């Protein structure tokens, strides 16, 4: 077995293992669209001797962080090991060399959706957003008397086919992922791919909608086999507003007994009813996983909250160096020193706690994060926090 | 109709209202426990001309609030209507004289758990809590590298009966509920209570085992009808050790598949697996709902977060004065103002705020609390924050 | 109502009565290649009066028997009666013809598959092979330390695709229905249909995908709606190594919950594993059905077991004659005799006996097989078991 | 840790670790009735330092073999380690000391019901008889006209309150144990148990019946929740004509769609009926499992097949001993050499043999049992081949 780039020979192999790893695969088709996201030393294949046995790739993303920065970010994806060669240390070998490129090529974040829980933590990645699924029985849903947009006249909101407004949802989406973090670019191919989507196939997903207002779009579509299910596949909303007014459009699909959304936990959905029980946690989930590839350089380019007086800690990352962090007015300085550790952690924990999803007092209830110092505890998880609740952008 | 404090003739058609309004009604030997704990004046009823169709009262609670501040609290309970005299004002009718006789009394706060909730919101109840059902496949949880309680040598944890350790639980709960906003002082009688329920009921509950450590305690008992599923109906831990050392002997139930708890947010369990997607979010719902009764004494009263530096504010709650706010080195100051408004919101929103469950930045990203600063929303969010997260205690 | 072979022009009705009465059912293109397996005088049909109401036929199989013999086997299918013409006797009339034509034509057994179980008994068959379906749940599944190719270098097996190696599954598949009782031939157009089935469907089957080692090759597919379940369509092993290594790859599918195939009940498969408990039989059923045509012939035809010592005994079968059997060193001897039975048994009983699924004795228990000689029970046991497992080929 | 026989004060704790191990445990009053059956030092637990953490015992069985022969066997039960005290070798501990205890007290057997399937394999015990639940859709059920007891008259077969018929079930079962591999002796005691079982508890079990025949009984109530399944607890039947006649009077119970019963794979049940089919196979499991603690002991009690002819081999059994076996005329001789093996296998794997339930076949093809003589294999299958099939008789 041997370790290289694939040549383009080596694209047939691929595709098969794909097709024979994801049931999510769409074609080849799909597949070149997405492929224009993946640098040229973006990939590496395993042989064995000889067919393609072992893959994984990067693709070149831009993340948004805390402080509305934006990181150039190494997205892992089509990572497989044939089920004829499990536990040949295959992705150990291809996850280390992928690292290497990735680390050597300057990017200070790698990130990856991960297919289970418990594979990627040994390689540094930290869960670092979740998903919340809502599900709203709309046949109770009454709006609060403070919910924006209840006054008299006219819709903000109109129902629309997706494919005749794409201009519109780009410029939406492009507002929205500079302003939270998780957000990500999406490239004219992924619109490409999406729109492409939202018609129906022949038993397959029916017609999606959109409901487009100035300031913020939702796509759904009527569940495949549950009639009385409407998805939202995707909410985008800038303003409080473009929120409120979007799920008033969307309880107004009388047809439906139930909305559903994959979401965040701090969407506000449920304070916009009389009876926030209605806006029911049916499933919660893992999102965006981050590998801290750089510390100084992840630690120096974000925002922290500026309610923290300034302070200075020792930071120790197992395996990842050993830095002095000052953190005041909003900002890091990572530089570093042979002085005692203060914090210590593993690098996947530091994912877990870059765009404020987890706070460092819990991970430090699980041992995961030590210090002494419940005052240093204190200041960590209100220098982390986020500002603007983290979401997740698209899946990849 | 006529609104009145019942006299012991009136004790029988109370009972026969709550057998008929509460399905999981013990009858009124347990009632007899429970209402030791109902002061003199504590109780309205509602008669027809004459039978009881309406009754509410309040129990004597004392409530763990941020900073460890005990609160005298009203426990809000036996609300119940006759379905033969709905939509006739009788629960607006009682909740206005138990609500005079709580403010006149000198409770700060009032509390309750909800049956539904659309109803209390309007009574200026806000939800405080948030409960959080955890199911763990027990058959895959591993215990990470840096979880504690892992070396070799003796367990610190005991599977014991618990009706045989009564004084071991009492002292872990009384420094438990100390420890935790949300926390609830249990009275003798409600420990009599809870070491009945312990026992099984023939077609009823299986027998309650319980896990002892020197600093936490698990009571649980296996399912009614699943056979595979062990429910933990309490776990107080007063040490992250004690958490950690609980969870390894309950993963040890090895002829389960699935144990279930219903925890809070923060509940570090997930951090202590090598595969925290194992321990999955089953089911989340409003615990505890606050009703602030006096704004000053409830706001001076709790500690806030000593992270965020001096601040001063004017805050309107609607229909609950207006006051001149002040927050520095952990403390509040709250004096009546006539100067202009920063910050407005309802009685129940102040309730939601008050444990730190519920960000302000949430609540006025949904219109529940306007202000046009909002510099001045993040300082709230992170004052009113908890250091120690908010727990439910034991429903009422 | 006339009963006849049917001339070209009757065909697009049978291919009505065909669509009516299987859902199974693929359109006249499968059917076309199916139609080569029926010889010239191979159908009849019932027309009232005038249109089709009732039909059947046989294909010219090669079917393997104990001792590794191919018979010429008459293959019944596409038998459907109207519902409009029921309990008229169109099957008993329709069976009565294609026997005669089949025993005139030479055939020493007939087969077919049953839709109902309680049908086919009355017309002289009897279920000759059991499907076992073994549910796998593959996230617990742990190779023996006895289980072969568990050793270190290169697998043995290549995940395919099954339309680019048709040359290497019919070579495996060739050796493998030689080799076991149950097996039949696979003519060049059946492998036609069968590679065309692997393909994808639009609102249909997943893609399949092969599992090839030089002496075995698995056939399998995700499910439709369980996304986590992959379906053995087939496995063809003709080593214990192939068997083992292609369980290896298959336990390997890493994305799958649960394996499941329709096997037989000596699959080795529980055995490779240290929990024999996790292979789960899941269902049970009749496979193939024969009858006996001609009772020597089929009696001298196989082999018998060799550790059985030479005995002679008179079998009667229900209007099917009276024998002196003589078996002694694997082979059976079979005259015509008027001496006294010792053993009686209706047709379909010999047939259940034929491929050595059914033990005499169970069947004796039943009062199926009649002797007063526990004995001549105990030999005929010994002499009609099978050393190789039978099997099932393919559905017909 | 100690390991010890427990003194008169360990059995509260034991009784303690029981509730908390087993979910279908009996108090301590079903736990006097079956404590008679362990010996003086049939029983150890384990102290931390100080509470019982560990416990097993084996009581005194008798088991019927092939041959009709009767074994003392050791039956292991009531083994449990304390959620607290997992993954610290007190179950091999505990294993290791009672196997030497039943091994010095000379005991060629000993047997256990697993509670998985993935446990006793490395402690020497082989899964040695098969459960198979049959389902019968009782209203499609019609008798086959060969089926024993269709005649006009009267019935041999009573519906009867199983208490007032004590003296006849013992009678009935004490013939079938003797006649039946897997057969056990079953004491007054556990008669006293079985009979208490019988009738209906408030919100537990349903009241028993029983159909009584001279030469068999079944005992069966009506489902728990399902009110159209009669389950049979227990059918014991020492002739054909008595199975086939009460299985008539099940099929006769009007008021059920479904009766199911867990039997062993040659059940003849299904060759009663016109539809082989309508008797489903709905559940399969491992029963019984031996380890033979006395391999020459065990190999020359038991009784072989008369039908293969005399034949000598070595058999090694891993750290087990090595031995020259001779068969023929239906006995074993079985003494110690250091000859050349020609078949190998691990002690459980003698176990599943032992009962005839496993093909030495099988297993070979797993690589449990290594031989390089296939002639040598047949001899073997055909030798073990138990005459009456191997069924289960009580749990324990
Ligand atoms: C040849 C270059 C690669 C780049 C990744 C890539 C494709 S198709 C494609 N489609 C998608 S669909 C969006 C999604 O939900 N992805 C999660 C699951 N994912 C795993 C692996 C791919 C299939 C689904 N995503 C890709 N990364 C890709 C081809
Ligand atoms: C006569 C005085 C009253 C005081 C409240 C009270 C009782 S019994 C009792 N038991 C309980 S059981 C604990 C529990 O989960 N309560 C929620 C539902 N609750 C609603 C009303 C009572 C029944 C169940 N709780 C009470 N407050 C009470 C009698
Ligand atoms: C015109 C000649 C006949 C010969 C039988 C025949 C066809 S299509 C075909 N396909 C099949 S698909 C393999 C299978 O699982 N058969 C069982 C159910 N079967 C019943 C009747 C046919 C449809 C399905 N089988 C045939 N015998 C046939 C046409
Ligand atoms: C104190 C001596 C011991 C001897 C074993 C023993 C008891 S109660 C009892 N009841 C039973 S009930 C029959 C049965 O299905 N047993 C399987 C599960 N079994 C596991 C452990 C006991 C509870 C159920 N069986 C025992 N061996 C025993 C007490
Ligand atoms: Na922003
Ligand atoms: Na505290
Ligand atoms: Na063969
Ligand atoms: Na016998």
Request: contains cysteine; charged residues 25%.
């Amino acid at each position: 077995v041997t370790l290289c780039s694939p040549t383009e020979d080596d694209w047939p192999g691929m595709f098969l293992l794909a097709a024979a790893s994801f049931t999510d695969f769409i074609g080849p088709e799909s597949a070149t669209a997405w492929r224009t996201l993946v640098p040229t030393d973006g990939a590496v294949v395993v042989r064995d001797g000889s067919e393609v046995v072992g893959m994984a790739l990067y693709m070149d993303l831009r993340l948004t962080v805390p402080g509305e920065v934006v990181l150039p970010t190494a997205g892992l994806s089509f990572v497989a090991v044939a089920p004829t060669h499990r536990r040949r240390g295959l992705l150990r070998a291809m996850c280390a060399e992928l690292h290497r490129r990735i680390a050597d090529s300057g990017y200070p974040v790698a990130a990856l959706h991960a297919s289970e829980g418990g594979i990627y933590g040994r390689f540094g990645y930290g869960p670092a957003t979740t998903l919340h699924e809502l599900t709203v029985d709309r046949r109770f849903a009454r709006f609060h008397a403070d919910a924006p947009g209840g006054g008299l006249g006219g819709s903000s909101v109109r129902l629309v086919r997706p494919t005749e407004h794409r201009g519109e949802f780009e410029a939406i989406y492009e507002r929205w992922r500079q302003q939270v973090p998780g957000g990500l670019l999406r490239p004219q191919v992924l619109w490409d791919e999406l729109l492409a989507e939202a018609k129906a196939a022949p038993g397959g997903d029916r017609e999606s909608f959109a409901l487009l207002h100035p300031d913020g779009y939702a796509l759904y579509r009527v569940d495949r086999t549950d009639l009385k299910l409407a998805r939202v596949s995707e909410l985008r909303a800038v303003t409080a507003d473009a929120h409120c007014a979007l799920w008033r459009a969307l309880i107004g699909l009388d047809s439906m007994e139930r909305i559903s959304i994959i979401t965040h936990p701090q969407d506000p959905l449920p304070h916009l009813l009389t009876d926030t029980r209605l806006a029911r946690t049916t499933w919660r989930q893992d999102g965006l996983w981050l590998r801290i590839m750089n510390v100084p350089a992840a630690l120096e380019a974000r925002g922290y909250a500026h309610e923290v007086g300034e302070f200075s800690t020792v930071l120790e990352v197992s395996d990842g160096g050993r830095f002095a962090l000052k953190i005041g007015d909003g900002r890091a300085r990572c530089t570093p020193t042979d002085a005692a550790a203060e914090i210590e952690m593993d690098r996947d924990v530091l994912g877990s706690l870059y765009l404020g999803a987890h706070r460092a007092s819990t991970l430090a209830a699980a041992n995961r994060l030590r210090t002494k110092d419940s005052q240093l505890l204190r200041r960590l998880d209100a220098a982390f926090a986020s500002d603007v609740p983290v979401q997740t952008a698209f899946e990849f």
